[model samples]
Target chain A: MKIAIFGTVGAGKSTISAEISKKLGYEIFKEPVEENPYFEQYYKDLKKTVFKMQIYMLTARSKQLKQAKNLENIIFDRTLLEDPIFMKVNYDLNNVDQTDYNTYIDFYNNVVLLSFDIVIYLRVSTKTAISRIKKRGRSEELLIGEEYWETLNKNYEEFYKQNVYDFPFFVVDAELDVKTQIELIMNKLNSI
Target chain B: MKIAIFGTVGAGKSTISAEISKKLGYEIFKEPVEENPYFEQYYKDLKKTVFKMQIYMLTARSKQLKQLENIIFDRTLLEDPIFMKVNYDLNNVDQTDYNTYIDFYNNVVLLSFDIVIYLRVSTKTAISRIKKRGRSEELLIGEEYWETLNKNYEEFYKQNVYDFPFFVVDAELDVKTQIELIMNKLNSIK
Candidate 1:
């Protein structure tokens, strides 16, 4: 069974995915952030690095998905399907123009998406996400402001409300204790 | 032969479409802008009227698309997606309404035109024409709005995002010369 956990920046997606993977004996499929050179550039200058980061992430995620294809029980910190949320936000803000957006959307539409058994969204408030990011002390993430996070959170909330997925989906309160968060997801998974 | 003329608010699509229709002896299916009750409301209050105006236009255009053969449309149903995307980007239309609009758009069968003629003009040119026409309603709109529309229209023209074969015309030309240019293209295509 494939499981994907999604959230906005600093929403504890990786931590939750690690804990769940430990309990379920599933291999963790992590986001290829370390290999991406555009992360810092994108944080400092969105217009210059946004499209490159998307292309890099899309290619990396495609490869990652292929590697995890044969696994029976796997968990991903996030999935490529949610990549468009960021792209759309950037496009809305005019950081990315329509031509680039069309190119990105075409690339996105052509990707063979994975069929996950279940997807979990960690719903964290914008304030909480900010606090968590400050706690992590990532220099790049520190460059981003509160309004950008708020906009991202709004888009994430919109995506959650749309729920345009086929698989079982759950929204876990990220403000809850990790034990409770895991319990909520486990209950949903078991019931399904 | 079916044809559609597309452009931004003041890009002269109607004048071009009329001339093309007259020269080609084809019926002109114009936009239902006059009958859309939500137009004034939309101009007055976007948040309250954007969704209704979209739905009104979508329904009206869908009906118009089916009612005729060998017609030159002033604006095609394909442009509606561009409008919706702009509204969504501006945050006037929420995601739910935007998704619903997309669903409707995808489900509807649009009449394929022989060629789509785009009246290409700069944002400044469009705004200048709008002011020249002297409509108080349009005067209330922001320059940024027209800039966004022009940006989207240019992208739509360059990429052919709607999957239609687009023919771009220089809107700075005189109407008679513009019509001649369009007629030449139409004759070649047909």
Candidate 2:
């Protein structure tokens, strides 16, 4: 059984996935941040890093999916499938460009409408997300504005509202502590 | 008989493609500049259009590549994506966008090419050539940017040399010599 945890930056996506993985004995795939090399570069220059990082991350995700296919009982801290939400929010904010945006959507549609048996969306308020991000103290977190946070959170809601994934999913109120959130998620999974 | 002439700005892609079209009677395909609004707008502010334009161009190229049964083309779907891949300015264009472009090229753009001719120009030579051409927007492209793009094109050519139906020409040669060489290359193949 493959499960994916979903949400925006500082939304406790990794936290939720790790806890779930531990209890369920599923190998966890955390989103590669510092390991990506581009992550640090993106903070220093907004214009160039986004393009390089986007490509780098995509390559990493493609590699990740290939590995996941052979493994069972796997949980991913984030799903590459939902990456378009970030692309859309950035584009809407004029933080991104049309040519690159269209390229991304075309590639995404052509290649990746992935299957996760179940997706556990961790919903959290943007304000709470911002606070959590501050605690982490990454330079990239400092540059991300409130609007980017709100826009991203909104994009997630808008996409799921469309029932685009066409897969079974459950939402966990992530404002709660990790332990509490895990309990709610576990109960829901148990009943299923 | 489809052919794509490739090179960085002012590297003779247009010149070579046009000559091939005239001599061989193949239809000619030009890059969409005046038609694409984002090219000028991108000169004003980095945003407002990179992603949209990239998508727009991808769509256009996808359409063109699907159609051109026998034509000589200036520019290609594969070329611009290489520019975007190297010109990664922490803008709206992110990793997702980059990968999408790659997948699109892999599945759609590459298979359409019957012949691809790359015009290889030194960074110094290309810069001088771009100045001589004198398009206002083209002048805005800095040396660093030019160097970055040239490097990427070289890198892409190296990795994909084994797969693509490709030929390379030195752009420093006079037009007559380059054209003569291409004619010879073209005849040898087709």
Candidate 3:
């Protein structure tokens, strides 16, 4: 079964995914956030990096998903289709050019897209999401402000509003600690 | 009317397009080869540049094609689908990306070219011109590379020869003569 971990930054998704992968002995594909060449540039210039970052992520994730196809169980740190939620936010804010937005949509439509068997959405308030990010602050993570989180959360909700996902998904609150969330995840995974 | 010129290096497609645009005042859309951020790195790593170049060209071309009602495009990646296939066989690029690029070419450059002007120059002529231009950094690139590119260009043009009305422009001809032929063809078409 293929599962994707979905949540904003500092949502404890990587920890949950790693734990799940360990317990289930499934492969884990973490988002290459820190290592992405475009990641740091995005903090510097939103224009150039906005489309470039998404394309970089899309290309990387496509390769990973292809590798995961033959596996019995796998969990990804992020979802592919949900990239548009972020793109849409950028587009509305005029950060992304209209041409970039159109091309992005076309690229998503024709490219090999992911069909995660289930998505484990980490549901957390924007406040909690920001607070967690502040605690263990990496320089890259520190650049993200409250306004960005607010817009991201609003856009994520807006994405769900506009479209309904076909696959199974379960949301977990971010307030839950490590052990509790793991328990909740394992129980939910087994049930699903 | 949207016209596309297709040929390999040193075929004088860009030169011809410029002259025609000057005479007719049509908008000229040149290939973003030099300016392409991905282009500089293509020689070092084929895989990364192949997809990036195609995507960059596609995105840039789509906007230009939309903005202009009548344009004379100097070059296009649309014809360069054949180039990727050759690279794939050489093991310089991946098959998956090769397929993705072809699909992108079809989708992004879907604007039906009103007239496809194929600049036909002999392999010897192209090799000589390219050597004279000396813009290409690959000293390793010799007659063999031009021969292969010519072979692919012929194959691609042959595929569409029956369906599309292709105007053959011999690049071996002098500039004035070539312009006269192209203008004659355009005038007759109208």
lDDT of 2 by residue, A1-192 (tens): 778888778888777877887899889886568676667657556556565456555556766776788987788888786777767777887765776666667656643336787888888888888898998547777875577789888888887778645867777787888889989988877886
Full ranking by lDDT: 1, 2, 3
Off by over 4 Å in 2: A36-59, A90-113, A127-148, A175-192, B22-30, B35-38, B41-73, B76-114, B118-134, B139-188
What TM-score does chain A reach in every model? 0.93, 0.91, 0.90
- Evaluated on chain B only, what are the TM-scores of all the candidate structures, in order? 0.91, 0.86, 0.85
Q: Estimate each model's TM-score.
A: 0.50, 0.65, 0.58
Candidates arranged by DockQ, highest first: 2, 3, 1
User: Taking the tens digit of each residue's C-alpha lDDT, what string does model 1 give over A105-144?
Assistant: 7445532238888889899999988999998637789886
How many collisions per candidate?
Answer: 0, 29, 0
Query: What proportion of the real contacts between chains A and B does each prediction keep?
Result: 0.00, 0.03, 0.03
Question: Candidate 1: which stretches are off by over 4 Å?
Answer: A111-113, B1-190
Where does the lowest 10-residue lDDT sum fall in candidate 2 chain A? A106-115
lDDT of 3 by residue, B73-136 (tens): 8876466576676677666656545655564455324557788899998988878777786365
lDDT per residue as tens, model 3, A58-84? 666666655777777788888776777
Q: Give Cα distance to truth, residue A64, candidate 1, Å.
A: 0.7
